[PDB]
């Protein structure tokens, strides 16, 4: 399909402008959520939303709204890099670069050396999205805890000495920094 652009943390007035500029310059379809066709995520205020996180996981451009303003002014979609939100999200340019250099379809390898994980059904952010993030960044998620050495999110079941019980933020901070953060900083009781 046509590449998609996703807005996040975008106030109403700014959404209007983005929609109008895309209608003028073409080249994109606006989607509500980051998905496999998404190449650009535009943020109105640099907050770590799920769309930002999925954007990083997929190696999208994660950009300030000003990219749209200057593209309008100059009459075409201009270079993205000057507007990339690398100060807030260090991994953004790293995954974006990896993705653009990938021969086959891009998939991150951040969690490739981690053991099997199980994500709590009660996780925050929501389990389906959190599992997607782990998978996109090279991790392995089992649908049952029996096989997992890492359990992420709320867990009131029987705990084992052979398992690490971590918060969801271990996953998110790792993705944001492009490095596996220390698990002991994220112990969840």
């Amino acid at each position: 399909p046509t590449r998609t652009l996703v807005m996040t943390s975008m106030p109403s007035e700014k959404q209007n402008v983005v929609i109008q500029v895309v209608d003028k310059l073409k080249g994109f379809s606006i989607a509500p959520d980051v998905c496999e066709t998404t190449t650009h995520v535009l943020s109105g205020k640099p907050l770590r939303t799920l769309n930002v996180l999925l954007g990083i996981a997929r190696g999208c451009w994660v950009l300030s709204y000003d990219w749209v303003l200057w593209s309008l002014e100059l009459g075409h979609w201009i270079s993205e890099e000057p507007f990339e939100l690398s100060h807030h999200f260090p991994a953004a340019p790293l995954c974006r670069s990896e993705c653009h250099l990938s021969a086959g379809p891009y998939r991150g390898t951040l969690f490739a050396d981690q053991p099997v994980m199980f994500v709590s059904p009660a996780s925050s952010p929501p389990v389906a999205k959190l599992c997607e993030l782990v998978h996109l960044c090279g991790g392995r998620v089992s649908q049952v805890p029996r096989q997992a050495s890492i359990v992420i999110g709320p867990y009131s079941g029987k705990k084992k000495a052979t398992v690490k019980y971590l918060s969801e933020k271990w996953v998110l901070d790792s993705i944001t920094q492009h490095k596996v953060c220390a698990p002991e900083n994220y112990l969840l009781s």
Binding site: T8, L47, R48, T49, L50, L53, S124, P125, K169, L172
Partner: peptide, 4 residues
């Protein structure tokens, strides 16, 4: 959208 929630910030996480």
């Amino acid at each position: 959208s929630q910030e996480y």
